[PDB]
């Protein structure tokens, strides 16, 4: 539900989130470019076909509000989309 549906609406793919890692704004600010207001839960799925890691960064539980979507290719290059 919710979160995974978002990944599909954004990528089209039906990906299953495999882990959710908690990161602080400074750890994130470093990569996304922007600094979130609070702690970020990075939900990561892996699209084996394209061999990309699809990461849906939301806010912490229990809110889980979508903040940015990040697609990283096999060569570590990111495609960031602020939601």
């Amino acid at each position: 539900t919710n979160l995974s549906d978002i990944i599909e609406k954004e990528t089209g793919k039906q990906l299953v989130i495999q882990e959710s890692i908690l990161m602080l704004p400074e750890e994130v600010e470093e990569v996304i470019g922007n600094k979130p207001e609070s702690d970020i839960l990075v939900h990561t799925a892996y699209d084996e076909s394209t061999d990309e890691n699809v990461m849906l960064l939301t806010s912490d539980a229990p809110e889980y509000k979508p903040w940015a979507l990040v697609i990283q290719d096999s060569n570590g290059e990111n495609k960031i989309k602020m939601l």
């Binding site: 400074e26 990561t44 539980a61």
Partner: protein, 227 residues
């Protein structure tokens, strides 16, 4: 209480001295209460028998390396009680693939199974310990506020005091701020999370190499990181 606690959770006895002192904390009683009220209206992972499987692979004295995690994987079948570890019939999640990647880089002579079940390491003295021991199926960080971390902290604190010369691998700021071991008595190694979002590729982490170089100086044998 220890006999009953140990009963419910199937905790190994070697861990009695580090855990027992914590039951007597009123905040622990409430933690257990909150845990039990939850299993009644929510699917909690991992299964009750696995919540403390980390106390079963080696004794507190056999411990050599302590790796800290956050909460358990929330999709059923994944988690089995150890940080980062996944049951053998489950594909290694993204962070685990990077951890396993950093291992092969340090030790290229290693024959990896391609699998992600870390119970081999646990048996060797690597304590893969999360600070939040349970999670509701499908909700991440759902039990992160019920008090598991104050508890786990209490046990690590005792472990560190009882056995000098432990190596600690703290990945990500969260883990670094959570556990603050004495750095004059123990080897505290810090790094960015193994997550793929991290600015620095984890495959460049040499903690497994430094950990062993350290164990060499204290006359303890190195851990075989291959898995």
């Amino acid at each position: 209480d220890w006999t009953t606690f140990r009963r419910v959770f199937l905790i190994d006895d070697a861990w009695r001295p580090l855990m027992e002192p914590e039951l007597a904390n009123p905040l622990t009683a409430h933690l257990l209460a909150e845990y039990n009220r939850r299993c009644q209206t929510e699917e909690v992972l991992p299964p009750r028998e696995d919540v403390f499987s980390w106390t079963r692979y080696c004794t507190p004295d056999e411990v050599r390396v302590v790796i800290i995690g956050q909460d358990p994987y929330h999709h059923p079948g994944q988690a089995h009680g150890l940080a980062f570890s996944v049951r053998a019939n489950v594909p290694p999640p993204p962070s685990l693939r990077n951890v396993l990647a950093a291992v092969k880089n340090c030790y290229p002579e290693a024959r990896m199974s391609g699998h992600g079940c870390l119970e081999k390491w646990a048996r060797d003295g690597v304590l893969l310990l999360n600070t939040t021991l349970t999670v509701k199926r499908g909700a991440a960080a759902s039990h992160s506020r019920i008090g598991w971390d104050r508890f786990v902290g209490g046990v690590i604190r005792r472990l560190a005091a009882r056995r000098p010369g432990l190596v600690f691998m703290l990945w990500g700021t969260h883990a670094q701020n959570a556990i603050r071991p004495d750095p004059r008595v123990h080897c505290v190694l810090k790094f960015s999370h193994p997550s793929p979002l991290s600015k620095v590729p984890f495959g460049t982490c040499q903690h497994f190499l430094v950990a062993n170089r350290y164990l060499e100086t204290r006359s303890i044998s190195p851990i075989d990181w291959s898995v």
